[PDB]
Design a protein around this nucleic acid. Structure first.
Lengths: 338, 306, 100, 125, 124, 130
RNA sequence: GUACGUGAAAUUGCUGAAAGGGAAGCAUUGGAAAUCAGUCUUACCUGGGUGAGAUCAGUAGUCUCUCGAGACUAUGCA
RNA sequence: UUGAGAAGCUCAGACGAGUAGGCAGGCGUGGAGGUUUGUGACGAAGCCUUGGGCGUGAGCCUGGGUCGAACAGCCUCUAGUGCAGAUCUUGGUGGAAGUAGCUAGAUCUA
RNA sequence: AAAACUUUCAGCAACGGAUCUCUUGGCUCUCGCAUCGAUGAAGAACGCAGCGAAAUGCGAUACGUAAUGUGAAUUG
């Protein structure tokens, strides 16, 4: 399973780890990793957007770069340095891809939009402190936002547009309106306000207004995973207290179409949307995971154990490698082995 | 052996078999001695081969242990970390603050004094009120401290030490054991205010290096040789041993160099076991786990993490 | 009787004429959060009952509210956890240390 | 509940039977389950253990690690599994024993007698 | 009504100090010529009904509470309305797991736990 | 085996044990009592004096002087075992002292007696730095 | 660690402590040394603002009971 | 005014030696039917301990240390059920005593 | 008055094998059945195993053969 790993020291490691490669085994062969990039802490990697085979990389100084992995070794296809004035107090919460466009929301509320081809730059203002931002895959120009003391808001650029719209006229500052604001759940048994802190948002309308029935699930800083449905109502359809630890990030597993989540104690599990309970749990991950990525029937997990754990959709450890440095984001380059 | 159920028979069967096992072990030792004294090379090769096993030698193989050759990747990562200000040309002087748990007793106040004795330039403020650890660390950041030590005491016995690195450095949580005061140490000594000389040994693994790195950051970078006070941190099977001594060299024949120092324990004396390493200020619930030990995995006594 | 059920104090009542049907024995009503309105509810529901019986329900409502209050304040404060102690791990670590 | 007076319900008598049983009675006491896909293939639940039967350990320190049965040690109700060993003092391998009701049979040793046993209990190959 | 006792020291058996086969449990000396049974000077005392304590103070701990033995967490709930007079004694064999469930529940209930710090350990 | 002395770990000490030794218990106790605290080489010389009748062991608890040789012979091997175990550790031989010795009763099968011995060091480091 | 589960008392050895003019012994009253008992301003009430929620809507639906009594799902927070 | 375990709660007064002996209420052990939707590998039973308590008392509850697989409170049933003695039975262990002495060596020393 | 010796108390190590837990044993009651030997019984002795210490098993066809089964183990 070829995969690329980012490190906090700014260097990127291309790993050709094959099935069964487990460094904890003394007899096992180590994977052949190739490292490059700047080895300085001021350009720590943050996220591993997977634009088809192309990979887009952010940096702690905003030195966004682009790589194409069809060639070995990969080469820096494109480069971008963000303005130093929008990183003076915030940090890149996420970049995500939507129909040939790049999203670069900041924690301070600012948000930048970049087109790879047209090279158009758009700035958008939002609500208070952002901690989770996402773009709807199927429908272009649908932005979900969340953060501490700021419930989820569904910003939409095209009202319906009935199939899609041209990418140039998306995210117009006058065309963005929130078509859905999350309603905080009722007070708990103690008549205490249920503290709200969104930490990660995923859209699950495929596994469960044009193309209505927005079915998406968010997580919290209080370990409670909350689903959603605009048609049913603003409040969550269901709410579960999965973990005591704050939930780190959430996502989907296309192989079984089953939602997965992790927390800051390294407890990654595969929640079920039909049985309303956690089934299984990825065993053997020590140290909180910095980023988890999955492709088809494989999943790559990296955290403060400084390792690359590999499992399948049915949580069986395939591979394991030691990465010396501190990983920050991972991406499976190829689901199939070398 | 165990087949026959009669008690007195199975004793006689063993004692007869035990005596036979000792007899043939005698003759094989004697003939080995007879042939080895005839050919000293046989003794030489046997000694060079029959090295008795030990837990350190039989240690399970883990890849995180760093090689003797210093790797550039490690230094690149560690030249800009939280403690780097203490290791760079800045040469930050670290000041320590020692606190307790809510409404503790006087047992700690006579052990934290021994802690303060081994830590010159280290204040102490007894915890008062409803202030939590995540709030002390914020306050100490603006006050002018570097690291923060807490001596949790319960049932009038101190058991856990947690320490955080200001302002946002990693937090460590050790469980103290065998904590003996300077009085309960035979041939104890009285210590002065001279700056002790740190010595850190046996921290081969990568995680152990970080824990050793933080402890190094805990000490004044300029030792006072004239006081010749030594503070020892030694890790062996994960049990970190903290000891203090006063060393005065003497002429010792056994040590082939010819010189070897006498040692006098100063106090304190305690163990630690790294229960959990956190990233960010120590939060019991909502912290990030750098490492939390599984208690069932430590049962493999040839496997370690520090 | 007055007994809480998930953060809400309910007033449970039974009668002689429903004593033979265990399922439908205990009629239940909900007592409001406003303590003054809670006591008016008890009297207008327990009326013409013996003063002893209404006396004991008011005390329980008083004593249950103080429970709910204390449960709230304790949650607010960041009280310490209580991690227990195992006799097998304590011994094994005690022996493994001495050898070290 | 037992109802026959031909059976007994005695801890003393049933344990006397268990540890007083000879090998031809111990060969049924040492049975093993079958893998779920193989269990339904022959429509039988459990079969007695046998040398050269490929099995997977399900319980104990040696959980998961597979192998075959080198020899069945009837007099102590144990199964000896190749490569499932233990490092003695002298560096040799004293292979630990697993009880027959913990492992699961994955690939049987198809003898002529085993085939008749399968079809005898309303089964088929 | 304060917790005042007519005597602190226990009643030991006569000659129980000399022998070890003789237990310290109080046994009435029935010896016919027993001068210690005869209440001479320099002898020991002897249990009498005159030594009973105040009936509104019998079974009361020095802080005024009467010990109440709670096995599980169900038992700690029924002390909701006697928290000013009873103290939730935790049984000796209750495991450290349910021991925390008993102490955390009793803390919010308002009742006093007598052995709340046994087998457990705090963590901040 | 767990001994009866808080010292005698690898610090500066070596042990030695005797089990069910076929010597009278009372003699061993008196022999052990007199040699406690002496220098290891001094104790060896004194034991030789007992063999040569130059010095006699006092009899204090089990009573004056006497010259047992069998009990001293048992102690000679244990002390020899003690220094042989010291060498394996690699201690400083010239400063060995008999820090601890203890004789215990054995099963009544002749009255045997377990014997243990602990050798140690005496040290003092000047503080100075005034 | 095969003198092998738990390992009591008698009994013996070592160490530390105090005491030790032909007894000891125990009882009362203390003292001294040594050591444990248990510590708790914190909460209540009142005032306002700020955001809330609901058992509240000059409000809308479903479920089980017996109009209204519960559990909820919207929606607004007066 | 809540004080109906009416077998409860409350009020008043006097009284208190004790053998033989008479009456009454309790404590404790093994097991038995019911029960605590009881406890227990996050440590049962046991054991020790100058930890803390409860009862006039028999006894009880608990902390710590050992320990490792069972156990208990309550209502009744039941009996091989409570020890300081019996020149008591069995096992263990001391003082006596390194004594009476017996195997060497030169009364002494082993 | 300290040591020695004597004494109490505590720590530690011996000694001893109680206590606690069980348990291929005992006892008790019920139930079913009818079966030794001159065709050599019961009992005894001597033998016998790839090696048995007891212990069982066996009789120069010796820790048993034939036959019917089971179907791969005996096991120090």
């Amino acid at each position: 399973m070829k995969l690329l790993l980012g490190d906090e020291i700014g260097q990127l490691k291309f790993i050709e780890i094959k099935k069964g490669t487990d460094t904890s085994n003394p007899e096992s062969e180590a994977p052949v990793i190739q490292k490059f990039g700047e080895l300085d802490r001021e350009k720590g990697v943050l996220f591993m957007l997977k634009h088809e085979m192309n990979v887009f990389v952010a940096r702690k100084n905003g030195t966004i770069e682009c790589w194409n992995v069809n060639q070995e070794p990969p080469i820096l296809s494109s480069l971008w340095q963000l303005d130093s004035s929008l990183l003076e107090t915030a940090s890149i919460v996420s970049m995500k891809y939507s129909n040939g466009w790049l999203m670069l929301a900041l924690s301070d509320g600012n948000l930048l939009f970049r087109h790879i081809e047209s090279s158009k730059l758009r700035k958008l203002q939002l609500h208070g402190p952002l901690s989770a931002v996402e773009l709807h895959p199927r429908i272009p120009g649908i932005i979900a936002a969340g953060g501490k003391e700021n419930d989820v808001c569904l910003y939409s650029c095209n009202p319906t547009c009935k199939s899609n719209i041209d990418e140039l006229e998306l995210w117009r500052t006058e065309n963005v309106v929130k078509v859905f604001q999350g309603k905080n759940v009722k007070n708990d048994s103690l008549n205490l306000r249920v503290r709200v802190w969104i930490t990660g948002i995923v859209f699950t309308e495929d596994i469960i207004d044009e193309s209505l029935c927005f079915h998406f699930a968010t997580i919290t800083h209080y370990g409670q995973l909350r689903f959603y449905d605009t048609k049913h109502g603003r409040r969550p359809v269901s709410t579960f207290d999965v973990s005591t630890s704050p939930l780190s990030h959430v996502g989907l597993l296309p192989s079984i179409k089953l939602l997965y989540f992790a927390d800051k104690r390294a407890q990654i599990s595969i929640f079920d949307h039909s049985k309303k309970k956690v089934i299984g749990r990825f065993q053997g991950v020590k140290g909180a995971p910095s980023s988890i990525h999955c492709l088809g029937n494989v999943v790559a997990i990296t955290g403060l154990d400084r390792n690359v754990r590999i499992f399948d959709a049915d949580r069986k450890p395939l591979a394991n490698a030691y990465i010396k440095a501190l990983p920050t984001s991972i991406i499976v380059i190829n689901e199939r082995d070398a | 052996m165990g087949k026959i159920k009669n008690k007195i028979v199975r004793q006689q069967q063993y004692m007869k078999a035990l005596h036979q096992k000792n007899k043939d072990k005698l003759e094989r030792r004697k003939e080995r001695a007879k042939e080895e004294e005839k050919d000293p090379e046989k003794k030489r090769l046997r000694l060079s081969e029959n090295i008795p096993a030990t837990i350190e030698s039989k240690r399970v193989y883990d890849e995180t242990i760093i090689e003797d050759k210093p790797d550039e990747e490690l230094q690149a990562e560690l030249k800009d970390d939280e403690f780097s200000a203490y290791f760079s040309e800045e040469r930050k002087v670290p000041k320590l603050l020692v606190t307790t748990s809510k409404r503790a007793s006087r047992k700690c106040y006579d052990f934290a004094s021994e802690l303060l004795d081994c830590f010159p330039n280290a204040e102490f403020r007894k915890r008062t009120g409803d202030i939590e650890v995540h709030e002390i660390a914020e306050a100490a950041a603006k006050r002018g401290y570097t690291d923060l030590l807490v001596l949790n005491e319960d049932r009038k016995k101190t058991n856990a030490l947690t320490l955080v690195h200001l302002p946002n450095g990693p937090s460590f949580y050790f469980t103290l054991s065998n904590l003996q005061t300077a009085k309960e140490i035979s041939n104890h000594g009285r210590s002065t205010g001279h700056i002790p000389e740190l010595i850190i040994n046996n921290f081969s693994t990568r995680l152990g290096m970080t824990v050793a790195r933080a402890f190094q950051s805990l000490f004044i970078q300029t030792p006072q040789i004239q006081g010749r006070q030594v503070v020892t941190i030694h890790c062996q099977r994960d049990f970190l041993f903290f000891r203090r001594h006063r060393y005065a060299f003497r002429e010792k024949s056994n040590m082939p160099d010819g010189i070897g120092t006498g040692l006098q324990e100063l106090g304190p004396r305690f163990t630690m076991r790294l229960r959990m390493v956190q990233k960010g200020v120590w939060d019991r619930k909502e912290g990030e786990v750098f490492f939390e030990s599984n208690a069932g995995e430590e049962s493999d006594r040839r496997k370690f993490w520090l | 009787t007055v007994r809480e059920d998930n953060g809400k104090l309910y007033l449970y009542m039974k009668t002689i004429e429903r004593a033979h049907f265990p399922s439908k024995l205990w009629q239940r009503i909900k007592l409001s959060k406003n303590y003054a309105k809670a006591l008016e509810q008890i009297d207008q529901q327990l009326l013409y009952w013996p003063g002893r019986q209404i006396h004991r329900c008011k005390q329980r409502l008083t004593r249950l509210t103080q429970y709910l209050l204390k449960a709230r304040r304790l949650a607010l404060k960041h009280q310490p956890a209580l991690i227990p102690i195992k006799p097998k791990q304590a011994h094994r670590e005690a022996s493994r240390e001495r050898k070290a | 509940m037992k109802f026959s007076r031909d059976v007994t319900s005695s801890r003393r008598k049933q344990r006397k039977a268990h540890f007083g049983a000879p090998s031809s009675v111990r060969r049924v006491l040492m049975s093993a389950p079958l893998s779920k896909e193989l269990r339904e293939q022959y429509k039988i639940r459990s079969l007695p253990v046998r040398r050269d039967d490929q099995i997977t350990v399900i319980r104990g320190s040696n959980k998961g690690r597979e192998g075959k049965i080198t020899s069945v040690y009837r007099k102590k109700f144990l199964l000896l599994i190749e490569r499932v060993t233990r490092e003695k003092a002298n560096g040799a391998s004293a292979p630990v024993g697993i009880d027959a009701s913990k492992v699961v049979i994955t690939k049987l040793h198809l003898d002529k007698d085993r085939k008749d046993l399968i079809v005898r209990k309303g089964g088929k190959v | 009504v304060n917790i005042i006792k007519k005597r602190t020291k226990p009643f030991k058996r006569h000659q129980s100090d000399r022998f070890k086969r003789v237990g310290e449990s109080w046994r009435k000396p029935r010896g016919i010529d027993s001068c210690v049974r005869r209440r001479f000077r320099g002898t020991i005392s002897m249990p009498k009904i005159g030594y009973g304590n105040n009936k509104k103070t019998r079974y009361c701990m020095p802080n005024g509470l009467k010990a109440f033995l709670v096995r599980n967490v169900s038992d700690v709930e029924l002390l909701l309305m006697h928290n000013k007079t009873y103290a939730a004694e935790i049984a000796g064999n209750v495991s450290a797991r349910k021991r925390v469930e008993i102490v955390e529940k009793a803390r919010a209930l308002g009742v006093k736990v007598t052995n709340a710090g046994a087998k457990v350990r705090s963590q901040e | 085996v767990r001994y009866s002395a808080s010292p005698a770990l690898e610090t500066k000490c070596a042990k030695a044990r005797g089990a069910y030794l076929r010597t009278h218990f009372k003699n061993s106790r008196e022999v052990a009592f007199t040699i406690n605290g002496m220098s290891l080489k001094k104790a060896f010389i004194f034991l030789d004096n007992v063999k040569e009748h130059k010095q006699a062991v006092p009899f204090r608890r089990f009573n004056q002087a006497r010259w047992p040789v069998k009990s001293v012979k048992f102690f000679y091997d244990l002390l020899k075992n003690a220094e042989a175990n010291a060498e394996a550790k690699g201690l400083d031989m010239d400063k060995l002292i008999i820090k601890h010795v203890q004789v215990n009763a054995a099963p009544k099968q002749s009255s045997p007696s377990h014997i243990e011995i602990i050798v140690a060091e005496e040290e003092e480091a000047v503080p100075k730095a005034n």
